[PDB]
């Protein structure tokens, strides 16, 4: 690969100027080793003070591995980089992927380093390895080749990748392959045994046709991914409190589903009764309960994915290591809901669990729609921003905002 | 002639679209012109500038200024236009090291490199933009026209290019001499080591030898100034550091710039003087921007200031960092949203101190603030030492566990242990998760007329207890809180409270222990006195009886 591809920022937009955030000594040392070798291999070069741009960088340990990986936070440059139709007006995101019985995720980002980057764009990939306490000047570098994490890298490399995959694809016509940023998602309906071998068959291809983390596979079974419909309790004795909670939950559901009614149920709450008093249900209230339960079984109507609009992901801490979440574009039109428990490694760490939940939800989003959601995190910004990079294991990074006032709706996904 | 290596040029551009400066030269007195001619003739002999022809169309004004005892003239080229049009640079000198991160050095020597500064060449394609004109005597000849060959003092790029140039030159020497440190600050190079004085000066000699490869002559900083170094507002002594003396003026009439300087000093002092407080003094300057307005002191500011003076009576010092020892951070609550902390490696020998003040807001609690203080210190500690300190917190392990397992947000505090240093941070009330058997059930409600501001708040209970109170100058939201307040006042130690107020739920589920709303404060005070409170929410206007009953009672 010798020929570059012309790339430019969006009109009337300068390159990024994002402050490097402080790094621990161990992450700094890891990056110094990584970038020293990258520099020897030609992937990056030192830069001068005439380059004012900057993009933050840090270091992660991918899931179940020893070596540090460099991770550049290109979110700012990605949004400033021109929209891409590299050779084609766009790839259709494969709706087949979310249906395969098993999807393996490969870090193929190392392949980008074999394509040179347009010499005029290189300046905009500048980043800094900070020193501790500003004791020495930060080490400044820019990319000479397609960088991992940059939006343009899969775009530009897409020609070179379709051909590497071509012998494998025409051999296996029912294997669905999707590329998102530095990841390759490879879905097959066949069962386990064949998969690791077929994935390794795919791996060898990239080695013959061309890596530090290529050996690993992230295994997913989207065919078993579970949704969370809204459930009403089934009880033989209802206290006043139970019925009040039920009417609240049904009143919230009536914003989502037509024809929810609570009149007969509300009628049982006649008078000013102790909260713990058992109220027998009237048959007309029981009928209303049954009707609402029927309504809640069906899907929400008029729910469509709109590729022009952002996906929004809300997350609630439910306690005991359980988290609920909903993905939507318009409020009350959920495209997907879910629940997680038993976040491994973090039974006494909220923020680690939240970080893994964010990564699992983003992964689900890439698979289903081919993009990442904007998160609404139930956490104070300063807590999140201090800690999330300690637990981050993905090579992409979504966007997020913070919820400071407690939603009433946490109750109705419990 | 010993060949010298060239210092690599930094290429420089103007901001896109913009051209270079074209500013008229002002008239100058005959005396100033002669002064400038002599100054510039010398600088021209030294290679600093070169005479140009008339085709260059750019210009920057030059001035001649006198000093008091030095009866010399000095030249000033005003590059403000050129700087407005010069590209942005990476400014490597943004971050200043904090003294508490520094390591003790047996020996440090200072080297003047201001003379090496003029060996840094200016990008040849940029020089045209630095042209200036000495007006001629009686304007009867063409003005003498010059441009820079070296980084002009006062030009936007000179600090960054000079510092980048030195760093690149120094890099191999530093890398191959890991037992020394080198730090550049303006025109001086500081070289520190733990070598004995003899082996230290040979490293210095070796460094001079290295610099001469680029032709850089560098003698000792003349008039070696005995320690401490006075640098960026600090005193760097050999074994300790501190802020430069902090003296708080005695005043009768305190204006708004008197207290900005006073909180600035106190903020600066608080990095080493423990327990500094600035809430009451800071509060006195909310909205004013006329820097001459005199503000009366609240007696709480006089108390706070007088407390600060006691802390400032004696000088205190911090120790330098030893990476072989642990790093520990200790926090105390001071009251009124104020927090103070010490960071040390061995007890009673602080590396530094500091403080944290609560964010602006209507409702808050001590645990959240302590959590914010911890994140602030964590991040500052990453900056200074590259690691998180172990914390000693005035909160029991069980309080924290109860807080974070029940709190609606994700939260986290790094490795820490309880220190028994009152006042302790505690949870002041804990709402029930289930309705209380045998506790009276209060159905509360309130409502106000948006026009008249007249309202009603009250409750009805399962025992037939009832109350409605008429209120003036209120709102829906305030009547909703007032109704909850009445139920707390009029119930026993355990009570179930039913409200339809999403606003009141939003506040109470946030678990405040203090508020700017006095009514919310009264509610917190009631909650502290209870044994059990279960707060239940229901939607309004849904025929939920009890709720429906008191809704009608309050809607007038
Ligand atoms: C070398 C240096 C000088 C200054 C000066 C500014 C002015 N103006 C500032 C900094 C940041 C700096 O850079 C670094 N400094 C340090 N440690 C400091 C700790 C305080 N001492 C004070 C002292 C000791 C000895 C003597 S003496 C021989 O007895 O006269 C006199 C004074 C100097 C060395 N560690 C470092 N580590 C790694 C990288 C850089 C480091
Ligand atoms: Mg009402």
Swiss-Prot record, chain A:
Q: What is the effect of changing residue 400 to L?
A: Almost complete loss of RT p66/p51 heterodimerization
Q: What is the effect of changing residue 214 to A?
A: No effect on RNA-dependent DNA polymerase activity. No effect on RNA 5'-end and 3'-end cleavages
Site feature Essential for RT p66/p51 heterodimerization, where: 387, 400
Shown residues within the full chain: 603 to 1027 of 1447
Q: Where does Mg(2+) 1 bind?
A: 107, 182-183
Q: What is the effect of changing residue 387 to F?
A: No effect on RT p66/p51 heterodimerization
Motif Tryptophan repeat motif: which ranges?
384-400
**Effect on the protein upon substituting residue 182 to E:** Strongly decreased RNA-directed and DNA-directed DNA polymerase activities. No effect on RNase H activity
Effect upon mutating residue 216 to A:
No effect on RNA-dependent DNA polymerase activity. No effect on RNA 5'-end and 3'-end cleavages
Mutagenesis / variant outcome for changing residue 392 to L: Decreased RT p66/p51 heterodimerization
What effect on the protein does mutating residue 186 to M have, as reported in its record?
A: 27% increase of DNA-directed DNA polymerase activity. 10% loss of RNA-directed DNA polymerase activity
The effect annotated for residue 169 to R is:
In strain: Isolate PV22
Q: Specify the effect of residue 212 to A.
A: No effect on RNA-dependent DNA polymerase activity. Complete loss of RNA 5'-end cleavage. No effect on RNA 3'-end cleavage
Protein name, please? p51 RT
Q: What's the impact of mutating residue 150 to Y? A: 58% loss of DNA-directed DNA polymerase activity. 42% loss of RNA-directed DNA polymerase activity
Q: What is the effect of changing residue 164 to D?
A: 16% loss of DNA-directed DNA polymerase activity. 24% loss of RNA-directed DNA polymerase activity
Q: What is the effect of changing residue 217 to A?
A: Complete loss of RNA-dependent DNA polymerase activity. Complete loss of RNA 5'-end and 3'-end cleavages
Result when mutating residue 150 to A = 73% loss of DNA-directed DNA polymerase activity. 70% loss of RNA-directed DNA polymerase activity
Give, from the UniProt record, the effect of changing residue 153 to G: Complete loss of polymerase activity. No loss of RNase H activity
Task: Note the effect listed for residue 181 to V.
Answer: 58% loss of polymerase activity. No loss of RNase H activity
Outcome when changing residue 52 to G = 64% loss of polymerase activity. 57% loss of RNase H activity
Q: Which organism is it from?
A: Human immunodeficiency virus type 1 group M subtype B (isolate BH10) (HIV-1)
What's the reported outcome of changing residue 384 to L?
A: No effect on RT p66/p51 heterodimerization
Q: In the UniProt annotation, what is the result of changing residue 164 to V?
A: 70% loss of DNA-directed DNA polymerase activity. 64% loss of RNA-directed DNA polymerase activity
Q: Where are the transmembrane segments?
A: none
Q: What is the effect of changing residue 180 to A?
A: Almost complete loss of polymerase activity
Gene name of the record: gag-pol
């Amino acid at each position: 690969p010798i020929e570059t591809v012309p790339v430019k920022l969006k009109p009337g937009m300068d390159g990024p100027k994002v402050k490097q955030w402080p790094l621990t000594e161990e992450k700094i040392k890891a990056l110094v080793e990584i970038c020293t070798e990258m520099e020897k291999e030609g992937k990056i070069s030192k830069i001068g003070p005439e380059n004012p741009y900057n993009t933050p960088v840090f270091a992660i340990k991918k899931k179940d591995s020893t070596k540090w990986r460099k991770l550049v936070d290109f979110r700012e440059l990605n949004k400033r980089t021109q929209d891409f139709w590299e050779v084609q007006l766009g790839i259709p995101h494969p709706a087949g992927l979310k249906k395969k019985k098993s999807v393996t995720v490969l870090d193929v980002g190392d392949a980008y380093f074999s394509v040179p980057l347009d010499e005029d764009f290189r300046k905009y990939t500048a980043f800094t390895i900070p020193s501790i306490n500003n004791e020495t000047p930060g080490i400044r570098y820019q990319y000479n080749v397609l960088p991992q994490g940059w939006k343009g890298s899969p775009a530009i490399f897409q020609s070179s990748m379709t051909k590497i995959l071509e012998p494998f694809k025409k051999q296996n016509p029912d294997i669905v392959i999707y590329q998102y940023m530095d990841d390759l998602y490879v879905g097959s309906d066949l069962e386990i045994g064949q998969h690791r071998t077929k994935i390794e068959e795919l791996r060898q291809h990239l080695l013959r046709w061309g890596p530090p983390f290529l050996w690993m596979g992230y295994e997913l079974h989207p065919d078993k991914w579970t949704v969370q419909p809204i459930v009403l309790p089934e009880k033989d004795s209802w206290t006043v409190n139970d019925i009040q909670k039920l009417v609240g939950k049904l009143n919230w559901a009536s914003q989502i589903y037509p024809g929810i009614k609570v009149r007969q149920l509300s009628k049982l709450l006649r008078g000013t009764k102790a909260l713990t008093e058992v109220i027998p249900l009237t048959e007309e209230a029981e009928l209303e309960l049954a009707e609402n339960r029927e309504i809640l079984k069906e899907p929400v109507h008029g729910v469509y994915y709109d590729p022009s609009k952002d996906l929004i992901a809300e997350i609630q801490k439910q306690g005991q290591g359980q988290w609920t979440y909903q993905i939507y574009q318009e409020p009350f039109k959920n495209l997907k809901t879910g629940k997680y428990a038993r976040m491994r490694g973090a039974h006494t760490n909220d923020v680690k669990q939240l970080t893994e939940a964010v990564q699992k939800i983003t992964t689900e989003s890439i698979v289903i729609w081919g993009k990442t959601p904007k998160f609404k995190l139930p956490i104070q910004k300063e807590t999140w921003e201090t800690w999330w990079t300690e637990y981050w294991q993905a090579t992409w990074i979504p966007e997020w905002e913070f919820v400071n006032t407690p939603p009433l709706v946490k109750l109705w996904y419990q | 002639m010993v060949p010298i290596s060239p210092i690599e040029t930094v290429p420089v551009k103007l901001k896109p679209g913009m051209d270079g400066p074209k500013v008229k030269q002002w008239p100058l007195t005959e005396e100033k012109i002669k002064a400038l001619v002599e100054i510039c003739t010398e600088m021209e002999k030294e290679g600093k500038i070169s005479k140009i022809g008339p085709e260059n169309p750019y210009n920057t004004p030059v001035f001649a200024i006198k000093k008091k005892d030095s009866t010399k003239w000095r030249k000033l080229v005003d590059f403000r236009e050129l700087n407005k049009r010069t590209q942005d640079f990476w400014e490597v000198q943004l971050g200043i090291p904090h003294p508490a991160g520094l390591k003790k050095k047996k020996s440090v020597t200072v080297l003047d490199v201001g003379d090496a500064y003029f060996s840094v060449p200016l990008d040849e394609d940029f020089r045209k933009y630095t042209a200036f004109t000495i007006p001629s005597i009686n304007n009867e000849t063409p003005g003498i026209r010059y441009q820079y060959n070296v980084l002009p003092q006062g030009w936007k790029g000179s600090p960054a290019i000079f510092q980048s140039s030195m760093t690149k030159i120094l890099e191999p020497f530093a890398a191959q001499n890991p037992d020394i440190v080198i730090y550049q600050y303006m025109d001086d190079l500081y070289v520190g080591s733990d070598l004995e004085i003899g082996q230290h000066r040979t490293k210095i000699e070796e460094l001079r030898q290295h610099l001469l490869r680029w032709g850089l002559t560098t003698p000792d900083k003349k008039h070696q100034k005995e320690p401490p170094f006075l640098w960026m507002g600090y005193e760097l002594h050999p074994d300790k550091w501190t802020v430069q003396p902090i003296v708080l003026p005695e005043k009768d009439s305190w204006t708004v710039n008197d207290i900005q300087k006073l909180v600035g000093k106190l903020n600066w002092a608080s990095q080493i003087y423990p327990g500094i407080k600035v809430r009451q003094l800071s509060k006195l300057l909310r909205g004013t921007k006329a820097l001459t307005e005199v503000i009366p002191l609240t007696e709480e500011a006089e108390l706070e200031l007088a407390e600060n003076r006691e802390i400032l009576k004696e000088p205190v010092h911090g120790v330098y960092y030893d990476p072989s020892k642990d790093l520990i951070a200790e926090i105390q609550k001071q009251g009124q949203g104020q927090w103070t902390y010490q960071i040390y490696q061995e007890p009673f020998k602080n590396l530094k101190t500091g403080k944290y003040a609560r964010m602006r807001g209507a409702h808050t609690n001590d645990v959240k603030q302590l959590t914010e203080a911890v994140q602030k210190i964590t991040t500052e500690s990453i900056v200074i030492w590259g690691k998180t300190p172990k914390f000693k917190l005035p909160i029991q392990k069980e309080t924290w566990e109860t807080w974070w397992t029940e709190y609606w947000q994700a939260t986290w505090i790094p490795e820490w242990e309880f220190v028994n240093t009152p006042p302790l941070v505690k949870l002041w009330y804990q709402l029930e998760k289930e309705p209380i058997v045998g506790a009276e059930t209060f159905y509360v409600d309130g409502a106000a007329n948006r026009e008249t501001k007249l309202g009603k708040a009250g409750y009805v209970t399962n025992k037939g207890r009832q109350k409605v109170v008429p209120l003036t100058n209120t709102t829906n939201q305030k009547t909703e809180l007032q109704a909850i307040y009445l139920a707390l006042q009029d119930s026993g130690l355990e009570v179930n409270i039913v409200t339809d107020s999403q606003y009141a739920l939003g506040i109470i589920q946030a678990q405040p222990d203090k508020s700017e709303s006095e009514l919310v404060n009264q509610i917190i005070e009631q909650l502290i006195k209870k044994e059990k409170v279960y707060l239940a929410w229901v939607p309004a206007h849904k025929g939920i009886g009890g709720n429906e009953q008191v809704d009608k009672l309050v809607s007038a």
